[PDB]
């Protein structure tokens, strides 16, 4: 495929800053833990840099196009993605196969500021049937993987909220939380080339002590 994975050391400042973004963006969810499990923090087991020259140049080419359409502003963010297809994504890139057809902002590729939101989709929409081994959406034993991704939003359409195309004149959609005052924003792109899966994070959710 061209993809290689480089392990980061826990002593590396880059490992520490990615872990901190994982841990600090956990919130409680309105489903009481149904989809993603009950936890306040993670046990991070490994963080790997995803290196693929073809996929990177695909991303930067599209970033330059968006930028030039938006007064030299890519509006680039680092955002989480959770999916049963994480292993296809790191080898072949994001495409229409990784879209959420039934999502609140239409058929596109969804990203979260809250790591705990992406965690709800590790084992499928709604958490599917949970981990393959124990059939448990709150499994504390099995190893999970998330992507921390570089995403080009460009001009984003703001949706106040309780593959298709971007709204005309826009490069993405922003789902702004309008009820749960603790929820962070979620974002949708409609072209796989507008994201690069930069870090692969392997972790467990941790059982609260109390
Ligand atoms: C088959 C899995 C496709 C949807 C996965 C998915 C959905 C999703 C969402 N709706 C909002 C915020 C983040 C995510 C995410 O990180 N992943
Ligand atoms: Zn399990």
Curated annotation (Swiss-Prot):
Coiled coil: none
Post-translational modification: Ubiquitinated at 'Lys-48' and 'Lys-63' by RNF146 when auto-poly-ADP-ribosylated; this leads to degradation. Deubiquitinated by USP25; leading to stabilization.
Subcellular location: Cytoplasm; Golgi apparatus membrane; Nucleus; Chromosome, Telomere
Domain PARP catalytic: 9-210
Residues that coordinate or bind Zn(2+): 131, 134, 139, 142
Effect of residue 104 to V: Loss of activity
Expression sites by tissue: Highly expressed in placenta, skeletal muscle, liver, brain, kidney, heart, thymus, spinal cord, lung, peripheral blood leukocytes, pancreas, lymph nodes, spleen, prostate, testis, ovary, small intestine, colon, mammary gland, breast and breast carcinoma, and in common-type meningioma. Highly expressed in fetal liver, heart and brain.
Known role: Poly-ADP-ribosyltransferase involved in various processes such as Wnt signaling pathway, telomere length and vesicle trafficking. Acts as an activator of the Wnt signaling pathway by mediating poly-ADP-ribosylation of AXIN1 and AXIN2, 2 key components of the beta-catenin destruction complex: poly-ADP-ribosylated target proteins are recognized by RNF146, which mediates their ubiquitination and subsequent degradation. Also mediates poly-ADP-ribosylation of BLZF1 and CASC3, followed by recruitment of RNF146 and subsequent ubiquitination.
Complexes and interactors: Oligomerizes and associates with TNKS. Interacts with the cytoplasmic domain of LNPEP/Otase in SLC2A4/GLUT4-vesicles. Binds to the N-terminus of Grb14 and TRF1 with its ankyrin repeat region. Interacts with HIF1AN. Interacts with RNF146; this interaction leads to ubiquitination and proteasomal degradation. Interacts with NUMA1.
Similarity section: Belongs to the ARTD/PARP family.
Protein name: Poly [ADP-ribose] polymerase tankyrase-2
Organism, scientific name: Homo sapiens (Human)
Included stretch of the parent chain: 951 to 1162 of 1166
């Amino acid at each position: 495929s061209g993809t290689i994975l480089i392990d980061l050391s826990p002593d590396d400042k880059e490992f520490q800053s990615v872990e901190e973004e994982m841990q600090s963006t956990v919130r409680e969810h309105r489903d009481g833990g149904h989809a993603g499990g009950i936890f306040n923090r993670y046990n991070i087991l490994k963080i790997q840099k995803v290196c693929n020259k073809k996929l990177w140049e695909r991303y930067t080419h599209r970033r330059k196009e968006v930028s030039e359409e938006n007064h030299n502003h890519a509006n680039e963010r680092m955002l989480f993605h959770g999916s049963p297809f994480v292993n296809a994504i790191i080898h072949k890139g994001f495409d229409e196969r990784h879209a959420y057809i039934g999502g609140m902002f239409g058929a596109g590729i969804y990203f979260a500021e809250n790591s705990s939101k992406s965690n709800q989709y590790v084992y499928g929409i709604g958490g599917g049937t949970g981990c393959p081994v124990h059939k448990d959406r709150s499994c504390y034993i099995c190893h999970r993987q998330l992507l921390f991704c570089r995403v080009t939003l460009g001009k984003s359409f703001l949706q106040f909220s309780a593959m298709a195309h971007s709204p005309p004149g826009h490069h993405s959609v922003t789902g702004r939380p309008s009820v749960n005052g603790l929820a962070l924003a979620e974002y949708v792109i409609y072209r796989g080339e507008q994201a690069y899966p930069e870090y692969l994070i392997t972790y467990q959710i941790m059982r609260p002590e109390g």
